[PDB]
Amino acid sequence: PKNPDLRIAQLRFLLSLPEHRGDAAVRDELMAAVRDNNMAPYYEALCKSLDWQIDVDLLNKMKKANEDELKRLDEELEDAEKNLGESEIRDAMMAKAEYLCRIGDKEGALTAFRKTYDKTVALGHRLDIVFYLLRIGLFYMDNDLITRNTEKAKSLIEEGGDWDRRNRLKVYQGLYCVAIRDFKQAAELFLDTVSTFTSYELMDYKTFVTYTVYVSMIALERPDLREKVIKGAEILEVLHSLPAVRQYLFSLYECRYSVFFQSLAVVEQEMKKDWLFAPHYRYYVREMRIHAYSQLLESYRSLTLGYMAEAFGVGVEFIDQELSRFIAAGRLHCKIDKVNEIVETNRPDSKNWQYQETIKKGDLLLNRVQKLSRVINM
Amino acid sequence: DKKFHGILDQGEGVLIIFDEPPVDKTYEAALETIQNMSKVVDSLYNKAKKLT
Amino acid sequence: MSEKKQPVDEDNWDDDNVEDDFSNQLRAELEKHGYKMETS
Amino acid sequence: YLASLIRSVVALHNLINNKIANRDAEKKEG
Amino acid sequence: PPGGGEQEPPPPPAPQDVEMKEEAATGGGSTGEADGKTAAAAAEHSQRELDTVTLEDIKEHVKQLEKAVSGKEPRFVLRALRMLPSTSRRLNHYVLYKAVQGFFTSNNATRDFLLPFLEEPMDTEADLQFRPRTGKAASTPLLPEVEAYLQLLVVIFMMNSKRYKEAQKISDDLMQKISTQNRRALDLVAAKCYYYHARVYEFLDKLDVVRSFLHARLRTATLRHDADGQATLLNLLLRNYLHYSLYDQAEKLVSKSVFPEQANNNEWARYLYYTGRIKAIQLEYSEARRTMTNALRKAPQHTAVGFKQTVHKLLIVVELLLGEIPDRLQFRQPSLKRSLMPYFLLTQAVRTGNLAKFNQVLDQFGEKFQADGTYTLIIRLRHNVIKTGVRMISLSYSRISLADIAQKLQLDSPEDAEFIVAKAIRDGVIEASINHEKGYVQSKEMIDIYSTREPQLAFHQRISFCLDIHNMSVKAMRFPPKSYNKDLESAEERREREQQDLEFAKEM
Amino acid sequence: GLRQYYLSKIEELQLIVNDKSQNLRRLQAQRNELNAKVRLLREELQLLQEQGSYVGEVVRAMDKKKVLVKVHPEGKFVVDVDKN
Amino acid sequence: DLYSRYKKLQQELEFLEVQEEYIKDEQKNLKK
């Protein structure tokens, strides 16, 4: 069973990427390993983590427990053939698959699951098999497995309502979308605060609310941030118990740019060490900052950079450098004059921006189609 | 709040009002059609390369 | 088949060069802490 | 521009179909 | 005895058994089909022989002690092929020799019996009519002494054998230059022999005489025919000139056979790489991009390691010379990350307008760049850094003092800043103007590019491309169909039945 | 000395003929396909004026190539079977 | 003899050209 296992992965990461963080999780992760008679995590964990030179006794005893359980399950299979119910051998191997998946490695679990997928004639059991496969894919980050299982589940759930399974699949799909750099679909799929969050396997509700507010700050704009995330009764009730996130949202919405930076720094520190946000934790930040810059200049026309010093954050040189490096990137359409320190605004037409994207997508597709054309015909 | 598009000038306290043309609806359909064509070209690999 | 050419010798979210341009040390400390020290 | 792109894609598909369907005809003669 | 009584003899018999169907059976099949009735361009044995040579490069690695594989050369030399019963008797004698080697010890041609392999073509009642077969057997015997050269100053024997093979090739070019069957079956063999001789010379000899011989052979060719022989020789000559520091461009710009239009996607990559290198070293950058992209994209897709390293490195260097290269290593390989990390630092310094980082990386990796043979093409780049800095600071600002320009470009002198800005303005890099009396620079802002003509051209190019590709596809349409003479409409004898039924209906 | 002259003249002509022999076959194949299509169309026009054939249910067979069938808008018919 | 080879080569070249020409005409007329 993979209901408690997800947390283990986090601890693993907390020892790999964080250089100095190697003292706290090292004991409770090993406690979780010594419980359940684990053997999967430390074929390579001992290699990557500390040597743990005094380990052979535990290894041998855990192995012997593994063969004991496997032999008992096989003898249950053998007893089950002679007097079968729904081919009770197949229910027995379904029961063995969870243990093999929890203790053993991936290939044995996958083979057992693909063997037992051919027994069930009920749709719910097939959906449960698919959910185990998806959870394993999330645990070990297998892109093809995740994609194939997601499309198979979406095809299979069409028969029969099963709206609970639909909500669970939506949460899983949102987690996968936010795992990659796709925040639009992640914030779109995270509208299940009111349509139930019974998927307590992956996480608790409070983390779900924090994730959904974090992605809603990226994906959507003011006329919707004022309609869905600031007016929601349930999200506001939950947020009332989290002063930091409420402050971080109200600071941006109420246009208190001075206090915004402290919350932004704290949040990015939090998500740097956090799972499934680390590999691009910088990119998120590089939006919010520039986003705030684009949320102030659009009202005035000739605001001086002196005002921004006390209104946005101290340091005229810092603001000058940031503004210059963001102008050079082609976004944040404005202009700055340094002889008199004056910022001017402009309004480019929405046809130039809607043209380079077409040309670049065309270039990429042409390269791909030429490669395809000359792969064939030697 | 995008219910009124113009601009404000603080030097003389002057509200400038201007209009903008509606967004062209021809391009975005072409963009997502290009994306669909990219998906089709991607799918052609499994049909072609699997025996060559 | 082949020649071996003897006589000579998404996986990452999205690929853009802006991500690797960064040489500073985290906005929290290098910038916000560095200029938020009360120099003013 | 778009129409030319679509025509090129269709031509590649037709070439693939013909080559695959015709390469499986020489071995039937033995 | 126990150690080698089951594993050592097996290594001899397994390699001998593999060479039985690798060269003996393959040789017989080529003799009966490729060297028998006729052999076309897509000969079933020519590609087979090339693949066999490539495999044999990693099939036999030891010196073949106790004639494990060395006696295969003595076995293939003991072939007559004079008559069908005579050929059968020669094969039987070779089988008897193999049986003796299984029982007794054959000649251990392991760095000790390469000399006695010269009179074999004149012995064993061999049939010299199959000139391509003799040439292939000589190239393969040369490869056995050229597979690793045995080092320890043993390249002299390989060079002597190569000289004998080259004399045989000159005789073949002399014997029926019209090629009744002299060159029509040995042209690929002649190209391979020339390549092997060039490789041996580059290994342990001098290329001046090889260059003269290659030029003479190419001059002898290109008159009787101008295909399959005017490319490998030209590539070898270009490589020989590339080893030195000659002009290397006068010969390439006069030959009309650089585009033979039939290269099997093999010599085209080398020709394009050489042309791109010459063009980049010849103060020309616009033309070489297409050629070098074609070179990189024509390379073998699987296991080409050392080759795409240098060409892709040169491609990114010259693209930096032009000034835009974000994507280079989206196909990372286990032997690709190590060899491309230093140039990463270069482009990271190049993209920014600063020049101190340029020196900071150059004074560090100058020796490494020299070891890679690109230092002369890497020092002429600071101008591009200044250009990109000026362009960026023109895009960012609109009215800026020149002292700040000098400070943010750290040119160490404000007086040269005005000269640099003027020079940039004159060639059309920017559209700004500077006031000498005041000091600041007033950028000129003019934006409305959709009303400009240029998008039309930017679409014309791709439209023409997409119109060409379709035509090419339809040009490669009907090649696979063949022998479709079957044409039956409805039946053979049904017409009589229909006519009888019509007559019966009319009568009634 | 004239023999080398003659052979050098012969070789290139032989190469040119060998080159052209392929385009000839391509053109012939295309022409054959189009002509077959046209003739098939005309014959298909011709052969559309023949009677249709009924559909029926068979109840049981007999000896020496005889079966019993029953088509709904009529009685039961005992008939024979074609040679195929 | 070698003269016959020469004359045969010229005959084959010319005759193949004529065939190619009228096959092009055939292909043009068939669609019409």
Tab-separated table of C-alpha atoms in Angstrom, chain E residues 71-280:
chain	number	residue	atom	x	y	z
E	71	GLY	CA	45.193	-18.619	-40.017
E	72	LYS	CA	42.017	-17.326	-41.641
E	73	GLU	CA	44.308	-15.242	-43.840
E	74	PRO	CA	46.326	-18.399	-44.627
E	75	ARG	CA	43.005	-20.188	-45.150
E	76	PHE	CA	41.636	-17.500	-47.472
E	77	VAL	CA	44.980	-17.438	-49.300
E	78	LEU	CA	44.701	-21.194	-49.973
E	79	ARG	CA	41.905	-20.729	-52.507
E	80	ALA	CA	42.074	-21.575	-56.216
E	81	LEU	CA	38.586	-20.968	-57.679
E	82	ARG	CA	39.784	-22.002	-61.140
E	83	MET	CA	36.996	-24.494	-61.915
E	84	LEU	CA	33.807	-25.539	-60.150
E	85	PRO	CA	35.268	-28.939	-59.163
E	86	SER	CA	38.584	-27.139	-58.641
E	87	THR	CA	36.887	-24.577	-56.387
E	88	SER	CA	35.225	-27.403	-54.456
E	89	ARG	CA	38.608	-29.115	-54.060
E	90	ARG	CA	40.174	-25.858	-52.844
E	91	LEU	CA	37.364	-25.423	-50.309
E	92	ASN	CA	37.880	-29.028	-49.189
E	93	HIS	CA	41.612	-28.380	-48.762
E	94	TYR	CA	40.820	-25.292	-46.680
E	95	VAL	CA	38.442	-27.411	-44.582
E	96	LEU	CA	41.203	-29.998	-44.138
E	97	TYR	CA	43.575	-27.244	-43.009
E	98	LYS	CA	40.939	-26.070	-40.519
E	99	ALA	CA	40.588	-29.645	-39.242
E	100	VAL	CA	44.372	-29.857	-38.872
E	101	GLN	CA	44.332	-26.583	-36.931
E	102	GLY	CA	41.679	-28.163	-34.725
E	103	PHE	CA	43.987	-31.151	-34.197
E	104	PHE	CA	47.505	-29.731	-34.675
E	105	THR	CA	48.811	-26.161	-34.518
E	106	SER	CA	48.695	-23.983	-37.635
E	107	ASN	CA	50.986	-21.038	-38.405
E	108	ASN	CA	50.742	-18.506	-35.558
E	109	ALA	CA	50.755	-15.325	-37.647
E	110	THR	CA	50.886	-13.030	-34.606
E	111	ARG	CA	53.507	-10.332	-35.304
E	112	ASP	CA	55.761	-13.050	-36.759
E	113	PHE	CA	54.314	-14.272	-40.097
E	114	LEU	CA	53.108	-11.118	-41.861
E	115	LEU	CA	55.999	-11.216	-44.346
E	116	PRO	CA	55.092	-14.635	-45.862
E	117	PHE	CA	51.701	-13.217	-46.906
E	118	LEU	CA	53.071	-11.582	-50.075
E	119	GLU	CA	53.447	-14.550	-52.457
E	120	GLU	CA	50.018	-15.952	-51.544
E	121	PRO	CA	48.244	-14.177	-54.457
E	122	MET	CA	50.742	-15.866	-56.803
E	123	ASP	CA	50.304	-19.258	-55.080
E	124	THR	CA	47.533	-21.776	-54.331
E	125	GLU	CA	46.442	-21.762	-58.005
E	126	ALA	CA	44.562	-18.516	-57.429
E	127	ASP	CA	42.306	-17.042	-60.120
E	128	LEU	CA	43.259	-13.420	-60.811
E	129	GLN	CA	40.250	-12.730	-63.063
E	130	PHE	CA	38.243	-11.421	-60.086
E	131	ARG	CA	40.328	-8.289	-59.615
E	132	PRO	CA	37.877	-6.789	-57.066
E	133	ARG	CA	38.114	-9.968	-54.987
E	134	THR	CA	41.915	-9.741	-54.920
E	135	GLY	CA	41.729	-6.055	-54.010
E	136	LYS	CA	39.269	-6.742	-51.195
E	137	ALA	CA	41.410	-9.602	-49.878
E	138	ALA	CA	44.470	-7.335	-49.939
E	139	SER	CA	42.639	-4.534	-48.122
E	140	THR	CA	41.386	-6.993	-45.499
E	141	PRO	CA	44.900	-8.474	-45.118
E	142	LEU	CA	46.202	-4.914	-44.841
E	143	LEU	CA	43.569	-4.224	-42.187
E	144	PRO	CA	44.782	-7.260	-40.170
E	145	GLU	CA	48.147	-5.487	-39.999
E	146	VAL	CA	46.360	-2.115	-39.715
E	147	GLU	CA	43.645	-3.033	-37.196
E	148	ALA	CA	45.950	-1.818	-34.429
E	149	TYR	CA	49.376	-1.688	-36.200
E	150	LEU	CA	50.791	-3.735	-33.261
E	151	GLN	CA	52.600	-0.483	-32.344
E	152	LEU	CA	56.246	-0.942	-31.271
E	153	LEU	CA	57.428	0.437	-34.632
E	154	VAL	CA	55.546	-2.127	-36.730
E	155	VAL	CA	53.879	0.439	-39.002
E	156	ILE	CA	56.722	-0.069	-41.499
E	157	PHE	CA	55.391	-3.512	-42.442
E	158	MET	CA	51.889	-2.069	-42.813
E	159	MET	CA	53.294	0.708	-45.010
E	160	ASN	CA	55.106	-1.833	-47.200
E	161	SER	CA	51.937	-3.911	-47.565
E	162	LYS	CA	50.001	-0.733	-48.378
E	163	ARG	CA	52.606	0.144	-51.015
E	164	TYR	CA	52.162	-3.300	-52.572
E	165	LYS	CA	48.379	-2.849	-52.489
E	166	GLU	CA	48.741	0.589	-54.092
E	167	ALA	CA	50.894	-0.938	-56.828
E	168	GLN	CA	48.158	-3.524	-57.398
E	169	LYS	CA	45.571	-0.723	-57.521
E	170	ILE	CA	47.705	1.176	-60.042
E	171	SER	CA	47.866	-2.014	-62.106
E	172	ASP	CA	44.071	-2.318	-61.910
E	173	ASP	CA	43.760	1.284	-63.092
E	174	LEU	CA	46.200	0.338	-65.870
E	175	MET	CA	44.589	-3.038	-66.642
E	176	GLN	CA	41.404	-2.122	-68.538
E	177	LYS	CA	40.927	1.490	-67.508
E	178	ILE	CA	37.700	1.287	-69.519
E	179	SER	CA	36.805	-1.279	-66.816
E	180	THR	CA	35.250	-4.202	-68.608
E	181	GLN	CA	35.359	-5.454	-65.047
E	182	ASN	CA	38.235	-3.628	-63.353
E	183	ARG	CA	36.802	-0.461	-61.794
E	184	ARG	CA	33.054	-1.113	-62.106
E	185	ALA	CA	33.381	-3.553	-59.186
E	186	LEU	CA	36.498	-2.161	-57.455
E	187	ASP	CA	35.646	1.563	-57.408
E	188	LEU	CA	34.385	1.252	-53.839
E	189	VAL	CA	37.341	-1.048	-53.159
E	190	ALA	CA	39.695	1.521	-54.696
E	191	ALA	CA	38.211	4.285	-52.540
E	192	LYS	CA	38.566	2.129	-49.421
E	193	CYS	CA	42.167	1.277	-50.334
E	194	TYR	CA	42.970	4.963	-50.827
E	195	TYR	CA	41.376	5.769	-47.464
E	196	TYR	CA	43.363	3.020	-45.724
E	197	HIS	CA	46.616	4.186	-47.331
E	198	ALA	CA	45.896	7.763	-46.247
E	199	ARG	CA	45.157	6.550	-42.714
E	200	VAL	CA	48.436	4.612	-42.555
E	201	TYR	CA	50.362	7.620	-43.881
E	202	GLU	CA	48.735	9.931	-41.328
E	203	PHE	CA	49.549	7.386	-38.619
E	204	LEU	CA	53.250	6.827	-39.279
E	205	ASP	CA	54.346	8.495	-42.528
E	206	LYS	CA	54.266	11.751	-44.514
E	207	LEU	CA	51.351	12.968	-46.618
E	208	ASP	CA	53.270	14.956	-49.264
E	209	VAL	CA	53.833	11.937	-51.531
E	210	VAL	CA	50.343	10.658	-50.702
E	211	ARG	CA	48.940	14.042	-51.748
E	212	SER	CA	50.837	13.953	-55.039
E	213	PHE	CA	49.655	10.396	-55.741
E	214	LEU	CA	46.055	11.295	-54.862
E	215	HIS	CA	46.144	14.351	-57.126
E	216	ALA	CA	47.516	12.228	-59.973
E	217	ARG	CA	44.855	9.547	-59.458
E	218	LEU	CA	42.070	12.145	-59.329
E	219	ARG	CA	43.402	13.760	-62.508
E	220	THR	CA	43.362	10.332	-64.159
E	221	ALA	CA	39.734	10.093	-63.032
E	222	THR	CA	37.089	12.784	-63.688
E	223	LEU	CA	37.681	12.117	-67.402
E	224	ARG	CA	36.433	8.568	-67.969
E	225	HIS	CA	33.694	9.062	-65.363
E	226	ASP	CA	32.723	11.674	-62.774
E	227	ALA	CA	30.932	9.699	-60.066
E	228	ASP	CA	31.843	7.739	-56.907
E	229	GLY	CA	35.556	8.540	-57.312
E	230	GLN	CA	35.754	12.337	-57.368
E	231	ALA	CA	34.508	12.750	-53.774
E	232	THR	CA	36.567	10.551	-51.434
E	233	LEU	CA	39.813	11.580	-53.142
E	234	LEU	CA	38.835	15.257	-52.982
E	235	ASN	CA	37.950	14.899	-49.296
E	236	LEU	CA	41.306	13.248	-48.573
E	237	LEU	CA	43.136	16.024	-50.436
E	238	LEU	CA	41.214	18.688	-48.514
E	239	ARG	CA	42.054	16.957	-45.226
E	240	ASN	CA	45.731	16.792	-46.206
E	241	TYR	CA	45.753	20.516	-46.968
E	242	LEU	CA	43.854	21.155	-43.716
E	243	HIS	CA	46.620	19.415	-41.765
E	244	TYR	CA	48.945	22.176	-42.984
E	245	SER	CA	48.096	25.893	-43.213
E	246	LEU	CA	47.759	26.270	-46.987
E	247	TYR	CA	45.213	28.443	-48.786
E	248	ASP	CA	42.889	25.415	-49.157
E	249	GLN	CA	40.378	27.547	-51.104
E	250	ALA	CA	41.756	27.886	-54.650
E	251	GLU	CA	41.342	24.184	-55.474
E	252	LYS	CA	37.864	23.891	-53.934
E	253	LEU	CA	36.543	26.943	-55.817
E	254	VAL	CA	37.494	25.622	-59.276
E	255	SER	CA	36.459	21.967	-59.131
E	256	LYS	CA	32.984	21.248	-60.513
E	257	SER	CA	32.800	17.769	-58.937
E	258	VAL	CA	32.316	19.029	-55.368
E	259	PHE	CA	28.611	18.380	-55.975
E	260	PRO	CA	28.615	14.861	-57.463
E	261	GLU	CA	24.912	14.622	-56.429
E	262	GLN	CA	25.546	10.967	-55.422
E	263	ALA	CA	27.483	10.687	-52.154
E	264	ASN	CA	25.294	8.263	-50.137
E	265	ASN	CA	25.202	10.945	-47.402
E	266	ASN	CA	28.790	10.056	-46.444
E	267	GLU	CA	31.224	12.432	-48.187
E	268	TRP	CA	28.736	15.319	-48.073
E	269	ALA	CA	29.226	15.766	-44.321
E	270	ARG	CA	33.020	15.927	-44.623
E	271	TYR	CA	32.886	18.254	-47.634
E	272	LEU	CA	30.463	20.582	-45.845
E	273	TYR	CA	32.592	20.586	-42.685
E	274	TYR	CA	35.723	21.472	-44.662
E	275	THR	CA	33.920	24.182	-46.647
E	276	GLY	CA	32.451	25.682	-43.479
E	277	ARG	CA	35.817	25.695	-41.728
E	278	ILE	CA	37.453	27.393	-44.721
E	279	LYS	CA	34.664	29.967	-45.027
E	280	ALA	CA	34.794	30.822	-41.321
